Design a protein around this ligand. Structure first.
Ligand SMILES: [Zn+2]
Length: 315
């Protein structure tokens, strides 16, 4: 018009698209929903200080659609808006270093995110979407705002919502390279005989029902269709870690027998997670808080163990 500035739009913050905007019009009148480092500027008109800056927009043509899928590995139409909305909050959280790991100072029911982030830094895992690769690298260095906002977006959780650690890891593992992970199980009924099953990928590293990896190797009792109880035991395992999960229950963690774990106090509606890690002693990381002990007992819901290759001796 009488008057313009130059700005750049983007969906990945790497590839930029030159634009000239009229300063008498809102960004939304010109681009649609528009964001400046997480802040929604759809209803704002351009300012002088905006010249030369980068704005996120939604994918609304073939070029941006391809750029967004290549970077994020999703075509959910609401993804970028949910990422930007979370980022406006996570960029204000604090990310203290606790016993050498990036944690999160408690805010907005984010305890489940803190213990997931602490867990990731203790297990061997590589992400596939460039967005997660780039953000996780930054989080390890201590600037985890983009990583947490992406976790929230991928998991369809909003800031303030209470999440579940097992479900959060399941979403993150879907976006990780676990192709070389393999699990063989055997289920034995005294009436119906035995049945072997093989699992791959995410399903090879996650089990729901018991926290103890040793008990899983000895055998755990599960329902059979004939009405009896059958025994399920681990036959073979190829993976760099395993995750055992169960509904929260009093459980004793022994120094040196596990990598890390999550503890949950509360009920179906509200609660609080803490993280326990086994190093030179047992450390309990609770957001920005840190305590130590030689023994630990509490309502544990997930335990992670190191692994490489295991073969049963059970015949
Ligand atoms: Zn049976």
């Amino acid at each position: 018009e009488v008057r313009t500035i130059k700005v750049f739009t983007t969906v990945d913050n790497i590839n930029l698209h030159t634009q000239v905007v009229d300063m008498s019009m809102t960004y939304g009148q010109q681009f649609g929903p528009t964001y400046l480092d997480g802040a929604d500027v759809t209803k704002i008109k351009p300012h002088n200080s905006h010249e030369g800056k980068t704005f996120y927009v939604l994918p609304n043509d073939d070029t941006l659609r391809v750029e967004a899928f290549e970077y994020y590995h999703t075509t959910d139409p609401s993804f970028l808006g949910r990422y930007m909305s979370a980022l406006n909050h996570t960029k204000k959280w604090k990310y203290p270093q606790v016993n050498g790991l990036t944690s999160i100072k408690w805010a907005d029911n984010n305890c489940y995110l803190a213990t997931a982030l602490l867990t990731l830094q203790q297990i061997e895992l590589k992400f596939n979407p460039p967005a997660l690769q780039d953000a996780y690298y930054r989080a390890r260095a201590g600037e985890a705002a983009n990583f947490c906002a992406l976790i929230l977006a991928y998991c369809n959780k909003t800031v303030g919502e209470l999440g579940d650690v097992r479900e959060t890891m399941s979403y993150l593992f879907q976006h990780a390279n676990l192709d070389s992970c393999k699990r063989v199980l055997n289920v034995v009924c005294k009436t119906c005989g035995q049945q072997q099953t093989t699992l791959k990928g995410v399903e090879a590293v996650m089990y729901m029902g018991t926290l103890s990896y040793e008990q899983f190797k000895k055998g755990v009792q599960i329902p059979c269709t004939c009405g009896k109880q059958a025994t399920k035991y681990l036959v073979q395992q190829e993976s760099p870690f395993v995750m055992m999960s169960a509904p929260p229950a009093q459980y004793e963690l022994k120094h040196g027998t596990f990598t890390c774990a999550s503890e949950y106090t509360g009920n179906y509606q509200c609660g609080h997670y803490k993280h326990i890690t086994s190093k030179e002693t047992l450390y309990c990381i609770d957001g920005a808080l840190l305590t130590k002990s030689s023994e630990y007992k509490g309502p544990i819901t997930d335990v992670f163990y190191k692994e490489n290759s295991y073969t049963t001796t059970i015949k």
